[PDB]
Amino acid sequence: AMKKVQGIYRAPRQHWVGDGFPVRSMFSYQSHGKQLSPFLLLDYAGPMDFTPTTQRRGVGQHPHRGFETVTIVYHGEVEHRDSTGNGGIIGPGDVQWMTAGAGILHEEFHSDAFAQKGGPFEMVQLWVNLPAKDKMTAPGYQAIRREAIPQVNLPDDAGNLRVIAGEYAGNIGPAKTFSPLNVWDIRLTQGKSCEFSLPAGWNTALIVLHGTLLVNGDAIAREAEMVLLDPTGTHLSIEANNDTVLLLLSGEPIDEPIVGYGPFVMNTQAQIAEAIADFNGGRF
């Protein structure tokens, strides 16, 4: 049985996060959050050309608690800093997987090298929820180099698939996760198609960044659109009408309440109140 297309959703207008991240919120837990779990949020940054500058564009220090954030860089360079003492530069093809867990402070800025030169900036920021038992896990950070992400050639010269998290055709992705999920970066060649088998009951979304995609033979998704699938079923087909770049997100639902406010995502309102009080009290 196919994972039926539930709907196609166009990106909203762009908004700024800080002065470094012009993003479109392609989905968020406030709408269809149960049908997207474990994924809470996806902000698509760019694509935008930045001017050479002496300024350090980015987003200043702020807290998170209760979930993980994933940065997938396509163009440009970001420098990461967080309160566990982790740092580093994420460039094209690199990924960072940050666990906020019990609580973290972080900031993200254009790298000095990217500041000096300018050019295209394109990135996806993904929030991944944690199961309740793991929400106060210790904060941590995975820097994932492009070279560590398997690139799998699709059959029939159809393109390639980068396994960031999860497993495709026996290729395991380097990102460690708290619940079972896939994050696949797919380049599908115009006129080519591919069939995917996904676990039964997993929530699944396709995020089209570039190109035009025919899904299940009957739904068309274009640049900066989200295809939300029905979790029931196991089979999905995609066909590229033009060379397409997409993210496939799929995961076992976390069947626990979502209570989110600002930078915090917990299971209850009292836990949100505790996060605000801890942050205000200097505990982060």
| Residues of the binding site for Fe cation | 62, 64, 106, 108
Residues sharing a CB contact under 8 Å with residue 4, sequence separation 6 or more, in sequence order = 216, 229, 230, 232, 233
CA 94 – CA 164 distance, rounded (Å)? 10
Residue reference for tokens 């994924």: 39
Buried/exposed 206-215: b ≥16 CB within 10 Å, e otherwise? bbbbbbbbbb
Residues sharing a CB contact under 8 Å with residue 274, sequence separation 6 or more, in sequence order = none
Task: List residues forming the annotated binding site for Fe(3+).
Answer: 62, 106, 108
Assigned token pair, 52: 């050479």
Dmax over CA atoms of the chain, in Å, equals 58
Task: List residues forming the annotated binding site for Cu(2+).
Answer: 62, 64, 106
Assigned token pair, 227: 């295809």
Task: List residues forming the annotated binding site.
Answer: 62, 64, 106, 108
CA angle 174, 176, 177 (to 5 degrees): 135
Task: List residues forming the annotated binding site for Mg(2+).
Answer: 62, 64, 106
